[PDB]
Symmetry: D3
Subunit: 270 residues, 6 copies
């Protein structure tokens, strides 16, 4: 299957791209004026070892900028420009009006660099956990970049990680909960059921064998401990120590997506 | 003066906030239903040493969520929760309907964490360069987060760095330029002038004493070398070696804003 | 708990209201001009037996039209104006500038009439099924009114029914499936898992004891037959015969929401 | 002439379609991922006797989903799948990427079902009134579905009915009017004239031979009684009794558009 | 009555204002930063003889910029700063945060200057025609400023002129018409009727006593010659000669709104 | 170079066009219905002596209306229909569906007429100043048409004038300044620098040899007197007297863009 198929042929994610171009040109592209519309060719370079992510998003930038692009690698491919003499790898060949190419350049690269950075981070941690013989799942969180959530959750997937719920309207989560606030797990979980119905899971962030059981009792579908039912462990986990997984179902962490370094990309005309 | 005064009392940056809340609740907040509207109090904690940034943005989230907030620190303040027993510092006190508080929580913290991360990174590098006796400026770039540019450039400022031009519609930049493509620096710079006029500067990314001079000749306002007039050095600079500044006017780097770690923040009800 | 708490204090649902007012006044309200801003009082009448639904939505219309409203009944209340001499019941008392009241009037009533119609339909069918001793759930579908989905799903809830998944991004559903198209239930269900992760359920529309088992095998969370696991029966069910429920978990039908009659409402000034 | 020609080649009605697709896919189409992009063929079935309406709207969904569609019937055609062995009639043949077809499916059918339901209702009542030898007009109202007004008014037209004014910015209507509130019909009608000018009609909802005459006096273009000049009768009329038309010009009723049942439609791949 | 009452308390015209502020501040108000939030007072001056128009629009700018404003004149008032020593007249007194005042300044004045310019032009021509004893109407056209149509039509009204139809969706107009294109006036007018119904007038741009009669025949509500029924004369009319009115009902001209000079306005702090 | 190259291949300026079409057709084009889709040909006429401006904007209207257009003149061309027998000049040849042509007509012409009017005004004043041997620049201002700023600034350029800064986020301007309000030019200019950085100029509206010098001192890039550094004179200048230029760098005036007459354009089908 192809990840980019998760994206509806049309929808808001495409207006996002447009909005991002506007963000770069509120009133006039001077550079395009000076450069003109002559057809040119260009190479899109990956300049660091990592996983290529964001292809369809960058593609959308290339389409709205009316350019012809040929990708040399499939999304998900691991790139190692280091084990290259030049230290860079051409991942795509682009042709079109000069001005168009330069207008797409920054925005497109801001997409790839960040998308790949996350894909790469996710992949390192999932494969790292997989190497210890862990059979469970590594997921993300809702601590995403305001307005960039679709792109980031998508990169998590390509990285080989679980995205965890998408937003507050998806799987319910009754988080630490003194504030949740009165009744019970048992009535907080009943109310949640009452509204979310059968098609959406309910997760409870418990604190004791009792807590959990009361949730399993109420019918919670997932149990969050935070230091037919599913067990999730979350909180300050990272590619570090940290190897301390055990037979618990889920391990969530923002480290795969928030605050992560980027994978450098580049674009130069023939 | 107050940085947040750079933000127009009303404008698109406020619709952004709204859009970000929608991004978190496409259809129903189940958690708010279960939690209810009872008034509660909560503390907003900074959980890592760093500079507090994003106050007005987080404030906008708190206003649209109709809450009462009292900030204990001014934006820009350096926080050191490490030199605290608990390892966390209350930066704001919030009151309002339970559901409202929990709805604002994630989005608000995604703002602060990232805004502060950048503010912090910028501040470290500017102060680091300042300690060596450098008198010039450290700037950012256009390699920003798609759709988050306003927030990121703003954080650069608070961090104590220059933002450099904002977008393609601001200071012109005739970048590496074989593609720029024919004529001269001299006619590329003339055309640019022809369109941008006197109120906006023109920068040329040169390669030789000649290149530069030809630009200084054409009237360029800034000279980019990239390894009454101004000299900018850019490319792969970071908090690392790297201390190799000299009397050149500008040093630009994405390290102060792109791929930077985040400053952890937290929110819990009384 | 209060249903209207499912709605985020702020989000796109409020811009919807605005857009709906624009839909009614593309360029000038002549009636408001002629009527003026004198303060007036008005009664909002329910003119048919049914369940009151859409309160917060109508409230939003009243707020943006800057009016003062006092509701005499809570959302969900069953109204029986028939068992009233006048044949109408005042559900709300409104005060404000004349023009404002008349501008809010139609839009507000279009909300209530439809919201209540659905609430009422849903309630009749759920209570009807409940009277036969059925313990399972009655749900809706995705056959909603383009652009009005939030309002309609919400009314389903108030009606006492399950909303079923909200959109294609929620619970996965592998519907009739020749088109789904090759591999297996088993690999269609694996791929779905691969993308949706643990926080979202997967439903398969099966055709045989085998089909189902293969799904239960693959790990499907729900089984749709369409004439720890859950059984759903769907297709042409209505308040009619039709009483033919049995111990299967879910019965979905658009009859509770699509093509339903409306509950008449009214508004007249003192 | 062709009804769909009423729709501007481009305008907001097309963004509506997009918005409706977003409404169905806030973040990821899982089904498309699993199904893939292989080309498939499909039949669009009408499953109930009624008039086909909404063609260009459904077409817009098919275009934005990049599919090839061939319609077998013209909009307005009366369909009678009942007088068919299978009980269904193929109204369109569609080809394109699997995922695209399934993404367009629901939204498209929600359009057709509702559009046809209204077209059908309108047509039944207009033809019903026409059979008694009535020569006047049957119109709709402003009690439309919030945000769907364009689609519904359009269906009224295809149904063979008058749409009546479109919104508050069109023909003025001085409705029951104690609230309209002081002066006269005569000065309310003068003020209205004062603002609307000659290109837009003014209607007054009168109560007595005097009322009307005073309006005809003031220059009203239409007279609404509500139980060179035109007479309109409105209020609780329906396909029921109700045959009680007489030589009055207009009979308005929401029954042709609000609360109406839908015409079932269907889509299955080869 | 009050003209500004034509504007719905809420609707798209208010988002327009916001959008206009964004147009002035894509990323940062530097001036506000430097000026600060200290409360200041300011006078809004009219600097040329003319009619004050655009009050509610400017008011909306002042509200979104959170300022306190007190108007010294009612909209429509004729101002003659020339017959003043200073040559300027204070039309409004404003108070609020410094930065806010300066941010509202330009946008607000761009509103007033243009709105008043049109109001003034319209008023001169209507009163000019009225002085010759003409009893008919002077109207505008659809040759308005892209995106500013609401503001301009509104100013026409205040100027004392007719706005004529608002857009293509209002009164139908079968303009010069070889292109309209085949059949007849008689079938073009029938088709138009067929779609627009009774609540909207149909105008035909005729060329001969026959043309007109055929239209009056078909049922046209207005007759446009262009050099119970109504006669309109249009084409190149202006405040110039040009006094050549006669007993024909309407005289339309863009001169009252398009290409018109502006009325200078000003704003300075205490 | 080509001016229209200043416009990004895609961005908000294109949504503007769409929005402008919606502004003309909120609900139904009756005229298109009656006219039909038959292919027709048409000539776009310039009806007054002036400079052709707005080509790409009008082109965008023609593209969204799906028409084929062939321009007979390049943007910037000076047209003199007066020195033509007919008194009109065909500037473009258009082909496409009848309805489409008529729908594009008004909006397109509203673009050209205004764009050319400004281009023409600007050109007259720049060439007028150039004829006296002035070597400096003539610029515009921020007194533009709300929402039309991009189109107007663009026309200024084609007219051969400087646009001056675009918005408040570009070149800083510390205008009359009692309100700016305390400290100094020297600290207002320092604060401005502090936020705008090196890539954006700072202009100070001075009053005395001292004022200026203090600014030149603080580092201002431009000096505005208003009756390596640059001198600007602004205030009430026009094509009138007024020839009183001297060796000062800039002369700004709204006369080239605000309140200017329009250049008449026309469109008729074969
Ligand atoms: O990998 P990590 O980034 O630690 O993310 C996971 C943790 O974050 C959440 O709590 P948190 O207290 O951080 O929510 P808050 O920031 O809104 O208060 C969650 O319950 C996890 O414990
Ligand atoms: O601190 P840094 O991130 O190195 O950013 C600064 C460098 O990036 C730019 O070139 P680059 O070749 O990166 O532009 P591209 O990525 O679009 O091709 C710029 O000319 C600088 O040399
Ligand atoms: O209560 P009801 O309205 O019957 O809704 C429920 C039925 O509709 C769906 O199939 P359907 O074949 O109707 O989907 P389609 O219309 O897109 O092809 C679904 O599988 C159910 O069988
Ligand atoms: O066919 P019907 O649905 O009866 O629609 C027609 C009636 O509705 C209107 O009054 P109504 O009192 O319903 O307006 P309101 O609901 O806003 O108060 C109108 O004056 C008609 O009498
Ligand atoms: O006062 P005025 O500006 O002359 O406006 C009025 C005239 O403009 C229209 O025709 P026109 O041929 O101008 O329409 P076009 O510009 O789209 O072809 C209209 O039929 C009037 O004759
Ligand atoms: O060519 P002109 O239209 O005169 O434009 C130029 C003048 O306008 C500005 O001041 P102004 O006092 O007009 O700003 P205000 O209208 O906002 O108060 C500016 O300082 C110039 O002096
Ligand atoms: O964002 C968070 O706090 C979070 C952290 C870990 C898992 C899930 C979530 C979530 O909210 O969905
Ligand atoms: O984004 C970049 O490539 C860039 C890098 C360094 C300085 C400035 C910029 C800029 O484009 O403004
Ligand atoms: O809309 C449908 O076809 C549908 C019908 C019954 C249940 C669920 C759904 C759904 O798609 O979620
Ligand atoms: O919506 C209504 O109340 C209404 C009812 C009947 C005719 C016309 C209308 C109308 O408002 O245009
Ligand atoms: O804009 C025009 O061409 C026009 C000119 C004169 C009157 C009316 C109109 C109109 O179209 O409504
Ligand atoms: O708009 C103005 O007041 C103005 C007037 C003259 C030059 C520049 C400007 C400007 O603000 O940029």
């Amino acid at each position: 299957p192809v990840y980019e198929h998760l994206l509806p042929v049309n929808g808001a994610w495409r207006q996002d791209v447009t909005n991002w171009l506007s963000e770069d040109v509120p009133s006039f592209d001077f550079g395009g004026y000076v450069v003109g519309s002559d057809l040119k060719e260009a190479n899109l370079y990956c300049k660091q070892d990592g996983m290529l992510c964001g292809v369809p998003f960058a593609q959308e930038v290339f389409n709205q900028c009316e350019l012809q692009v040929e990708w040399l690698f499939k999304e998900g491919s691991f790139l190692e420009p280091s084990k290259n003499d030049s230290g860079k790898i051409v991942v795509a060949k682009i042709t079109g009006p000069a001005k168009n190419i330069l207008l797409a350049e920054r925005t497109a690269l801001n997409i790839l660099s960040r998308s790949s950075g996350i894909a790469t981070a996710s992949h390192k941690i999932i494969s790292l956990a997989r190497s210890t013989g862990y059979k469970g799942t590594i997921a993300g969180t809702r601590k995403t970049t305001p307005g960039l959530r679709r792109l980031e959750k998508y990169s998590m997937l390509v990285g080989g990680c679980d995205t965890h719920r998408y937003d507050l309207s998806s799987m319910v989560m009754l988080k630490d909960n003194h504030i949740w606030a009165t009744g019970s797990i048992t009535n907080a979980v009943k109310n949640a059921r009452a509204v979310c119905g059968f098609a959406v899971k309910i997760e409870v962030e418990c604190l004791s064998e009792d807590e959990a059981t009361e949730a399993i009792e109420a019918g919670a579908d997932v149990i969050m401990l935070d230091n037919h039912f599913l067990l999730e462990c979350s909180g300050g986990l990272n590619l570090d120590n940290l190897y301390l997984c055990d037979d618990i179902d889920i391990y969530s962490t923002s480290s795969i997506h928030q605050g992560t370094p980027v994978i450098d990309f580049s674009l130069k005309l023939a």
